[PDB]
Design a protein around this ligand. Structure first.
Ligand code: CLA
Ligand code: CLA
Ligand code: CLA
Ligand SMILES: CC(=O)O[C@H]1CC(C)(C)C(=C=C/C(C)=C/C=C/C(C)=C/C=C/C=C(C)/C=C/C=C(\C)C(=O)C[C@@]23O[C@]2(C)C[C@@H](O)CC3(C)C)[C@](C)(O)C1
Ligand SMILES: CC(=O)O[C@H]1CC(C)(C)C(=C=C/C(C)=C/C=C/C(C)=C/C=C/C=C(C)/C=C/C=C(\C)C(=O)C[C@@]23O[C@]2(C)C[C@@H](O)CC3(C)C)[C@](C)(O)C1
Ligand SMILES: CC(=O)O[C@H]1CC(C)(C)C(=C=C/C(C)=C/C=C/C(C)=C/C=C/C=C(C)/C=C/C=C(\C)C(=O)C[C@@]23O[C@]2(C)C[C@@H](O)CC3(C)C)[C@](C)(O)C1
Ligand SMILES: CC(=O)O[C@H]1CC(C)(C)C(=C=C/C(C)=C/C=C/C(C)=C/C=C/C=C(C)/C=C/C=C(\C)C(=O)C[C@@]23O[C@]2(C)C[C@@H](O)CC3(C)C)[C@](C)(O)C1
Ligand code: KC2
Ligand code: KC2
Ligand code: KC2
Ligand code: KC2
Ligand SMILES: CC1=C(C#C/C(C)=C/C=C/C(C)=C/C=C/C=C(C)/C=C/C=C(C)/C=C/[C@@]23O[C@]2(C)C[C@@H](O)CC3(C)C)C(C)(C)C[C@H](O)C1
Lengths: 201, 211, 222
């Protein structure tokens, strides 16, 4: 059973809809607001995560198309062939650059991404922190801290966290955080349509 | 609707014609139901035939003009200059089956008394509004756009306007069946309908009612 | 279960369709036994057929696409590219006879009065639970897992979730008994399922003929 103020009904979805945009309101033709609280939370977090990934992908696409490559060597230290980020850039456009990336580099990147995914999904970590799983009444999008000294801390200390490593939010006001969440949802949708547009082009 | 109400309704449809029932089908008990049931069934049959005939008149014109969408591949690939019947017969068999099976589901939904009773209506024979297609609230997944009036232009209409509209529906469908069947007859036996002879109803050499 | 219970079950499976027995199997007394036991047998039959047909649908998709086990010789012996019905006919008959006898041992285990009443349930015809399968607690020898949930999942499931799952089981079984037979009918009768034309490979043999050589006339041995 849900025990939080997280949205669990079409009324709350409509409230958040007018909050993010008074004009559109709730645009739900498929009627996936007519679902259980757990599914509503799942859809909320899915939207948020697509926003994160789409924004990151769009900014990466812009930087890679501009051609601001890295100055290092990507391989060739532990007795392997030498490949440079300049070579990766000269491979082609962003999809071609990803294709030109070596296979274990891809595997390690995807592994770190999955590590962050599971640190998000781990209910015990959120409850050691101040949250629960987004399906069972948790805030959609909260990343638990990777730096900690609790029993749920890594064997070796981690320096910083994923979100807010140096407190750029610092103390944003108790509701301007929600304002930024609204702006984030809108910008995530915009970046979603944008990145699919660039990929289609 | 009782038979007195049927005579009344015929008078509203046309004050001059009245209750022209040369076969007296209204005075009958089909499958041993009541006379009110027979009236409801005949009313639904007339409304449904008029509806399908009105849509079929529009479809026959639209096909005869070779008006096809600018986004579809099937129609654009299909041969042009065909009659509407030839066009339907050369449509893919899977497409025909999807059309007929969706029509089957719509018929099942219309007949389903559970859905009508959840919406405050009944089956037409058992006493209810003939021609009322229920909404899609009871569906397993929540679709948008109920069939009748999907965008909601008649939500605020008045009962008198709606009664006038139902009378118009019956009469306009009555001549719509005649029009569509005129097209089919002229594509079949030539000279059946004189007036269309100039426009060149595209000849068809098959029995339409044999898929 | 009573016919009122069947009506309630049907109205919970599909509120609109409701109780839709048009042949009155629910009313015909099977073997002279009461309606409450004919209902049990018929409901167990529905559940069992749906189970076997769901498994058969997944298995037919697996066999037609030749996703075979990597470390067995029988699968290697069977030629590749055959129709899924033929992937059954190309097997040693001794393996068919052991699949069938495995189901026989399992369905002897299921209907056993002693095992059912030891675990707490009764026979499906004796007012028990239709579609239940007792675990191997009273087995002569130990065995690692049961059939239903060999692992632990759903050992702590609510009765509401179990009821929902049984309803979904019946409905998906009703649908899979038609999907699998759509595959078989399109294989052995082209243009029978209009939507699978050119999808299901054709087949000539009889899907209701398990063994190549007729067991009733001339079997084969190994
Ligand atoms: C191996 C790494 C890994 C892991 C463990 C996960 C884990 C998850 N992802 Mg995925 N995800 C990955 C890589 C990974 N992701 C990558 C590389 C991206 C970037 C493109 C994403 C982007 C992404 C999004 C945008 C979403 C998920 C979602 C999910 C959920 C599973 C959905 C499902 O059933 O998928 C079956 C296949 C889960 C939290 C969904 C989620 O969070 O639901 C709330 C979701 O919407 N992921
Ligand atoms: C519904 C019953 C059914 C029937 C009659 C058959 C019949 C056959 N299968 Mg099987 N199969 C089925 C369902 C079935 N399958 C399903 C649902 C799957 C998906 C897991 C498979 C996957 C499968 C593979 C990968 C292979 C076969 C093969 C075979 C052949 C030999 C038996 C065997 O390998 O056992 C199959 C193995 C099982 C574990 C039993 C399947 C049935 C249960 C319900 C599986 C439940 C899942 C379980 C967790 C794993 C024969 C044609 C082999 C073949 O083609 O040889 C020529 C082969 O390589 N089947
Ligand atoms: C030897 C194995 C064996 C045994 C003991 C059983 C036992 C049972 N099956 Mg069967 N069944 C088997 C194999 C077996 N099955 C296999 C391999 C499948 C495919 C996966 C099925 C699929 C199946 C279904 C779909 C159903 C049953 C049902 C039944 C019940 C009654 C069947 C009956 O006797 O009616 C028929 C009696 C006969 C003698 C049939 C004629 C058989 C030929 C002519 C001789 C074969 C001899 C044999 C192979 C040796 C009972 C629990 C029914 C049930 O549980 O209803 C509630 C039911 O619905 N079974
Ligand atoms: C005075 C006199 O003479 O009689 C008296 C006695 C009598 C006879 C008893 C009386 C009566 C009753 C009458 C006259 C009843 C008439 C009934 C009638 C005439 C009923 C038609 C239905 C048509 C339908 C449903 C068409 C569907 C059509 C469909 C779905 C299509 O074919 C679609 C399609 O075509 C398109 C659009 C485009 C093509 O690409 C493809 C095809 C071909 C597939 C009266 C009233 O008392 C008058
Ligand atoms: C054309 C072509 O090439 O392919 C086609 C054809 C082909 C291959 C055939 C196909 C197939 C599969 C099909 C059609 C399979 C059909 C299977 C079917 C129909 C199987 C019945 C079993 C009955 C049993 C076990 C009876 C037990 C009987 C018993 C034990 C009784 O006591 C009966 C009972 O009455 C008494 C004696 C007394 C009563 O008081 C009680 C009852 C009523 C219980 C496909 C997929 O369509 C493809
Ligand atoms: C593609 C390829 O080539 O991959 C290579 C990869 C790699 C890694 C190099 C290779 C390897 C090594 C592998 C994979 C090794 C696997 C080893 C493994 C899996 C070893 C099990 C031991 C089990 C025993 C001894 C059982 C005792 C059994 C006992 C004591 C029992 O009585 C069991 C039982 O009590 C229960 C449990 C419950 C009771 O109810 C029933 C009974 C009484 C019967 C291979 C082979 O080269 C293949
Ligand atoms: C021709 C035309 O016009 O139309 C049609 C004709 C035709 C042929 C019908 C067509 C088709 C295809 C159809 C309709 C196919 C249907 C197939 C079907 C219906 C297949 C179900 C499988 C279910 C399984 C294996 C379930 C396992 C479930 C298991 C083992 C579970 O774990 C259950 C579970 O409860 C537990 C125990 C624990 C809980 O935690 C919850 C879960 C869920 C995990 C076409 C091609 O589309 C076109
Ligand atoms: C690279 C990916 C990425 C991008 C491009 C991106 C962009 C923006 C923008 C756009 C300009 C705004 C305005 C914005 C705002 C907020 N982000 Mg966000 N963000 C990304 C990633 C994460 C992660 C991992 C988390 C997170 C969060 C929050 C919180 C909540 C703070 C709180 O109240 O704790 C707020 C207000 C955390 C959270 O709790 O989300 C529910 C969290 O874990 N973000 N974010
Ligand atoms: C292709 C099919 C089709 C055609 C070509 C067609 C043509 C006409 C014309 C001709 C010029 C008029 C004037 C007219 C008028 C009305 N139609 Mg109608 N109609 C079609 C289909 C349906 C369906 C599915 C429904 C429906 C209805 C109504 C109501 C509502 C009354 C009320 O709400 O009381 C009114 C007034 C609904 C209803 O209740 O019908 C009993 C309903 O469900 N119609 N309709
Ligand atoms: C493997 C072969 C096998 C087959 C092919 C087969 C077929 C049929 C048919 C099909 C025509 C019917 C209709 C039927 C019905 C019942 N079977 Mg049966 N059955 C088999 C095996 C066992 C075993 C091992 C037991 C058993 C039982 C029962 C009971 C429970 C009554 C109760 O306890 O109230 C009922 C009603 C249990 C029992 O009571 O046996 C004394 C029991 O132990 N069956 N059985
Ligand atoms: C290959 C065969 C097979 C398939 C494909 C299949 C599919 C589905 C689906 C489909 C989407 C659902 C949703 C579903 C749900 C449930 N199944 Mg099921 N099932 C299969 C086999 C068995 C066996 C052997 C048993 C069983 C059971 C249950 C229970 C427990 C209820 C309870 O404990 O009250 C629930 C909720 C056990 C039982 O007792 O069922 C009364 C049991 O023994 N199932 N099952
Ligand atoms: C084995 C061997 C040899 C060897 C070797 C050796 C010693 C190899 C060692 C390899 C080693 C040790 C490789 C580390 C990589 C670390 C990476 C990529 C870190 C990324 C770090 C990232 C992306 C961090 C991100 C964040 O931190 C940010 C920016 C802020 C925080 O808030 C959040 C997190 C934490 C996410 C010889 C001696 C040569 C001989 C022979 O060959 C055999």
């Amino acid at each position: 059973p849900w025990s939080s103020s997280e949205i669990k009904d079409k009324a709350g979805l409509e409230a958040l809809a007018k909050k993010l945009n008074p004009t559109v309101g709730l645009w739900d033709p498929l009627g996936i607001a007519e679902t259980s609280p757990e599914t509503i939370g799942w859809f909320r977090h899915a939207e948020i995560k697509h926003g994160r990934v789409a924004m990151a992908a769009f900014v990466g696409y812009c930087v890679q198309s501009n051609g601001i490559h890295f100055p290092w060597n990507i391989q060739g230290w532990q007795g392997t062939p030498v490949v440079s980020f300049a070579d990766i850039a000269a491979a082609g456009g962003p999809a071609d650059q990803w294709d030109a990336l070596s296979t274990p580099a891809k595997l390690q990147i995807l592994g770190v991404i999955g590590f962050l995914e599971m640190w998000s999904e781990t209910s015990v970590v959120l409850k050691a922190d101040g949250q629960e799983h987004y399906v069972r009444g948790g805030k959609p999008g909260y990343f638990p801290k990777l730096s900690r000294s609790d029993e749920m801390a890594f064997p070796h200390p981690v320096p910083l966290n994923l979100w807010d490593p140096f407190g750029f939010t610092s103390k944003m006001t108790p509701e301007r955080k929600e304002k930024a969440l609204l702006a984030e949802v809108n910008n995530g949708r915009l970046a979603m349509i944008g990145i699919f547009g660039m990929i289609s082009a | 609707m009782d038979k007195s109400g049927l005579e009344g309704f015929a008078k509203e449809l046309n004050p001059v014609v009245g209750y022209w029932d040369p076969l007296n089908l209204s005075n009958g008990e089909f499958w041993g139901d009541s006379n009110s049931a027979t009236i409801g069934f005949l009313r639904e049959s007339e409304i449904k035939h008029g509806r399908v005939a009105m849509a079929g008149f529009v479809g026959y014109i639209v096909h005869a003009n070779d008006i096809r969408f600018p986004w579809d591949k099937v129609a654009m690939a299909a041969p042009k200059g065909l009659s509407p019947q030839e066009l339907w017969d050369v449509t893919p068999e899977a497409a025909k089956w999807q059309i007929i099976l969706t029509i089957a589901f719509l018929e099942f939904w219309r007949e389903n008394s559970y859905i009508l009773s959840k919406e405050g209506e009944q089956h037409y024979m058992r006493g209810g509004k003939p021609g009322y297609f229920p909404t899609f609230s009871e569906l397993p997944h929540p679709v948008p756009f109920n069939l009748f009036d999907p965008f909601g232009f008649s939500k605020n209409a008045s009962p008198e306007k709606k009664a006038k509209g139902l009378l118009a529906e019956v009469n306009n469908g009555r001549l719509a069946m005649i029009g569509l069947m005129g097209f089919l007859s002229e594509a079949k036996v030539p000279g059946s309908v004189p007036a269309l002879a100039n426009v060149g109803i595209r000849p068809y050499a098959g029995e339409v009612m044999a898929p | 279960e009573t016919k009122a219970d069947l009506e309630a079950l049907a109205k919970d499976l599909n509120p609109a369709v409701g109780f839709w027995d048009p042949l009155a199997l629910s009313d015909y007394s099977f073997w002279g036994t009461s309606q409450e036991a004919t209902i049990g047998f018929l409901r167990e039959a529905e559940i069992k057929h749906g189970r076997i047909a769901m498994a058969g649908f997944v298995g037919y998709i697996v066999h037609s696409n030749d996703i075979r086990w990597t470390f067995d010789k029988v699968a290697a012996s069977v030629p590749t590219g055959l129709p899924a019905p033929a992937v059954w006919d190309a097997i040693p008959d001794i393996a068919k006879w052991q699949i069938i006898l495995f189901v026989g041992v399992m369905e002897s285990w299921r209907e056993n009065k002693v095992v059912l009443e030891a675990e707490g349930q009764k026979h499906y015809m004796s007012g028990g639970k239709p579609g239940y399968f007792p675990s191997f607690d009273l087995l002569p020898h130990p065995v690692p897992f049961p059939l239903f949930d060999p692992f632990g999942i759903s050992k702590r499931a609510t009765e509401e979730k179990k009821a929902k799952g049984r309803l979904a089981e019946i409905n998906n079984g009703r649908l899979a008994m038609i999907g699998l037979f759509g595959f078989l009918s399109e294989a052995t009768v082209p243009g029978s399922v209009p939507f699978l034309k050119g999808v299901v490979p054709a087949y000539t043999g009889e899907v209701m003929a398990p063994f190549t050589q007729n067991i009733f006339t001339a079997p084969t041995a190994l």
